Amino acid sequence: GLKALFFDVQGTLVDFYSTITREGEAFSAVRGFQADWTTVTEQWRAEYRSRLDQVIKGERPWTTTDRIYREALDGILANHPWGASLNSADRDELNSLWSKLIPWDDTAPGLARLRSKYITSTLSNGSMASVLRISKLGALPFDAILTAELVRSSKPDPKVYQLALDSVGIEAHQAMMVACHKYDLQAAKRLGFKVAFIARPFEFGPNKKVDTKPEQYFDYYANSVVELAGMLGA
Amino acid sequence: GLKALFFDVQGTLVDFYSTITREGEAFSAVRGFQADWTTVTEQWRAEYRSRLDQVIKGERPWTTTDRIYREALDGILANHPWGASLNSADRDELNSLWSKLIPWDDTAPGLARLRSKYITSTLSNGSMASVLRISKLGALPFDAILTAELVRSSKPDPKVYQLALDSVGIEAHQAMMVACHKYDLQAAKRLGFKVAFIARPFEFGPNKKVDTKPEQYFDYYANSVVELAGMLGA
């Protein structure tokens, strides 16, 4: 990280857990039902992985992640009674959430600092649509917005890390990946990137354990974007 | 136009003529010679687009616009008596100016104001790296940077404007094209965009004339970005 930092978004920068469980509470109660939004979040994400692997395994073909979440919702709604009462336009509204995820309280100030010293960009699996709307809404400054949609792929596919470099015009040794997911940081480190870990102990909500162990290949390890800004001289 | 705005960059938002003629005027000073930076500019932009046209046709493998300008520089430099004295690091410098184009005075505040009411992004023909770099340099605020290198093409190719709708999630009638070039707005309007024309009479410097007539098919017609912000109520 001597010229540009690339920031994973979901979990790393934004709280999808709180977003689905709180906004979904406004959705449920207003339709007269109560839903287990903690379970729904899980089945939706897991149903998004498996529906992504198949997208990465090569049999099921590429679609924007906004379309992946929306088809995943039809699968998991079928394992809830109330899912049947939601029409197709109800589920569009429910799916819209992923373009609305909430920042962690350190994301905006640490993004602002770092960009005062660096080129900053997203490198996320979300849609460009969602990631653009997530940053505008949450006031997150970025010099640019890149997602895996632009290469029709998915991290940890090297096509995706190459796009970071190509779109900013730098060598790997000049870039650093910022993610709370260690798989992401290995693929980047395989490819020569510098890497920073932001520990996100509540990524998946209050009752779950996450993996926040340090690791030697980590160039930096931080509990917030602001702390990472401090170790990088911003 | 009611949800998102897209801006052409060269000519429309940044003063490339001043950039080359000023910064270019200092490049020779450091090295002890003189040139017509006006003449170089015209030849350079011209050879670039001719070579560009050989990649659109496919008769020439696709290269980045930065690579494309770097080769054009070699071709035009043959015609000037100070050319042989620029080694290839001298020319790499010279080529770095296309990522340093200076905003027009109005550009920064109008984009700051127009981003308060709409989603906004570049949609220019240059490279991502250049466009990202000019924006960060001129402190120009955008929710996202898009160029036609993201689809290995160039305006008025319809992909380029589709890619605008795809990334933001909006259809063409809620999107607006902004440019000082009429070929660009002609395409945006056939594809259902609203279109705003920005008149840039000094685009090519003092001793030239520029067609900046209004048109029936323009949705808006302004002499600055801050003027266009005023007309859109921002």
What structural domains and CATH numbers belong to chain B? 4-15+101-231 (3.40.50.1000), 16-99 (1.10.150.240)
- State the pairing for strand pair B14-15/B194-198: unpaired
Contact B128 A99 (CB under 8 A): no
Q: Decide if B168 touches A, using CB distance below 8 A.
A: yes
Are the C-beta atoms of B138 and B129 separated by less than 8 Å?
no
Nearest to B144 by CA among B159, B132, B126: B132
Contacts of B149 in chain A (CB under 8 A): 167
Q: Which method was it determined by?
A: X-ray
Mutate which of A70, A136, A149 to disrupt the B interface (most B C-beta within 10 Å)?
A136
CA–CA separation, A25 and A115 (whole Å): 35
Give, as one character, the DSSP assignment of residue A10.
B
CA–CA separation, B222 and B195 (whole Å): 11
CA–CA separation, B6 and B122 (whole Å): 5
Contacts of A133 in chain B (CB under 8 A): 119, 169
- The answer to whether B142 is a known ligand-binding residue is yes
CA–CA separation, B139 and B135 (whole Å): 6
Contact B127 A169 (CB under 8 A): yes
What is the secondary structure of chain B as a DSSP string? Answer: --SEEEE--BTTTEEHHHHHHHHHHHHHHHHT----HHHHHHHHHHHHHHHHHHHHSSSS----HHHHHHHHHHHHHTTSTTSTT--HHHHHHHHGGGG-PEEPTTHHHHHHHHTTTSEEEE-BSS-HHHHHHHHHHTT---SB--BGGGGT--TT-HHHHHHHHHHHT--GGGEEEEES-HHHHHHHHHTT-EEEEE--TTTT-TT--------SS-SEEESSHHHHHHHTT-
Are the C-beta atoms of B48 and B68 separated by less than 8 Å?
yes
Q: Residue A69, SS3?
A: helix
* Residue of B129, B133, B144 with shortest CB distance to A145: B144
Q: Which residue has the tokens 């960059």?
A: B9
Residue A35 vs residues A42, A44, A72, B141: alpha-carbon distances, Å = 13, 14, 17, 40
Mutate which of A67, A132, A140 to disrupt the B interface (most B C-beta within 10 Å)?
A132
Alpha helices in chain A (DSSP H): 16-30, 37-57, 65-77, 88-95, 107-117, 128-138, 158-168, 182-190, 225-231
Restricting to A residues 23-62, those with a Cβ less than 8 Å away from any Cβ of B are none
Q: Residue A128: closest CA among chain B residues belongs to which residue?
A: B167
Q: Residue A93, SS3?
A: helix
Contact B119 A129 (CB under 8 A): no
Q: What is the dihedral of CA A41, A42, A44, A49, to 10 degrees?
A: 140
Are the C-beta atoms of A145 and A115 separated by less than 8 Å?
no
